[PDB]
Amino acid sequence: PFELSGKWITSYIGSSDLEKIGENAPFQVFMRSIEFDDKESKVYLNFFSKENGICEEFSLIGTKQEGNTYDVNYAGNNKFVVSYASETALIISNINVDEEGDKTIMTGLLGKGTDIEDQDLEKFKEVTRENGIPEENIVNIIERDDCPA
Amino acid sequence: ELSGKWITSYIGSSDLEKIGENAPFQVFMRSIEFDDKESKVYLNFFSKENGICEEFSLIGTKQEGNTYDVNYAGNNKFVVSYASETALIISNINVDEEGDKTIMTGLLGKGTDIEDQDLEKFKEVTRENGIPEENIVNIIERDDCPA
Known part of the structure; x- marks a missing residue:
């Protein structure tokens, strides 16, 4: 019986728009934990993100929707899915439509x-490729994660 | 109401090395939801690597006819060849990286x-996809993955 809830840190992130994952961008997300409340059809996401160089913590709440999809507001509208899950990893696929209306597909290990x-x-690299995201669009987040545990 | 939990029984492949143990298409289905309003399909299943189980949640989109496109170990295009209350036969065409096409079937x-x-009906649909009867593996025998 797989446990999906608990401690989760980001390792790598891929994106179809490099503007959303560089330094201090909205999607260079350093995960700390994800909690799946299936009884109340929600998801709790806690993580850090840099803005102007300093770490800023977030605590969002997403609502479960059609299929395995999850709706959440943050730098636009998101609809993410857990494409993969094993005892050591989780691979997320996300689709953001920012304030401007531009669509960005992202992935994370x-x-x-x-x-x-x-x-x-x-497996993460295989999912990234399937979303038509090239290898040069992958960033190592563990090397950039100097935010508080 | 062809939407609900569905477990894999048998699988037949035109490349026997794809449905073998520790192989990508040795799929242990758990649930399949067909969203008609939004034109999509939702697959929830397991597979295996080094004896350990791994969960997968995919999303596919309806196309011309009854064909669905979904990514998993390459680009797939499957059809629900047959659908009753007790069974669901699926015909699938997988095109991996190398461009190596593989025909498949699942009960x-x-x-x-x-x-x-x-x-x-599964063996008849199988032979129809140009797949040998030898290339059929019993998938419920080895489904010790979580419920």
Whole structure:
């Protein structure tokens, strides 16, 4: 029986728009935890993000929708899905439509800490590729995560 | 109401090396939801690597006819060849990285039982996709993944 809730840190993130994941951008998200409240059809996301160089913590709440989709507001409108889940990893696929109306598909490999299992990385790279996102559009987040645990 | 939980029974492939153990298409279905209003399909299942189970949640979009496009270990295009209350036969065309096309078939169920007639319709749809009877593997025998 898989436990999806608990501690989750971001390892890598891929994006179809490089403007959304660079330094201090809205989507260079350093995850800390995700909680799935299936009874109340919600999801609780806690993470850090840099703005003007300093770490800023977030606590959002998303509502479960059609299929395995999750709706959440943050730098536009998001609809994310957990494309993969194993005892060591979680791979999220997300679609953002910012305030301007531009659509960006993103992906992320989350884990239990700073130690990556290449098996989960290959799956993450395979999902990223399927979303038509190129390898040069992948950023290592563990090397950039200097925010508080 | 062809929407609900569906477990894999048998799977047949034109490349036997794809449905083998620790292989990508050795899929242990859990649920399939068909959203007609929004024109989409939702697959929820497991697979295996180094003996460990891995959950997958995919989204596919309806196309011309009854074909659906969904990404998983390459680009797929499947059809629900047959659909009754006890079974769901799926024909699938997978095109991986190398561009290596593979034809597949899957018999889905509700629990542990398999009716002789659905099993039969499955073998008939299989032979119809140009797939040898040898290339059929029993998938419920090895489904020890979580419920």
